[PDB]
Design a protein around this nucleic acid. Sequence first.
DNA 1: GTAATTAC
DNA 2: GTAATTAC
Length: 66
Amino acid sequence: MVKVKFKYKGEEKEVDTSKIKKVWRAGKMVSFTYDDNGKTGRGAVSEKDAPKELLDMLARAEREKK
DNA sequence: GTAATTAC
DNA sequence: GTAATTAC
């Protein structure tokens, strides 16, 4: 149960890392997609506000040989 | 404006 | 084609 909190378009949001589908990084910004109920949602946070679990998902994505 | 990527 | 996200 790792909850990621962030604001996207004025709206404050929470998402469990298990619903996160993809994670990448642009500079110091960590952006991702997640399975919103039915549709695919977006969110991003500062590296410094990222919980280790999210950063590990990022580190694995970088090593994916596919 | 660019970074990486997406949903719209 | 572009708004959206954090930093530069």
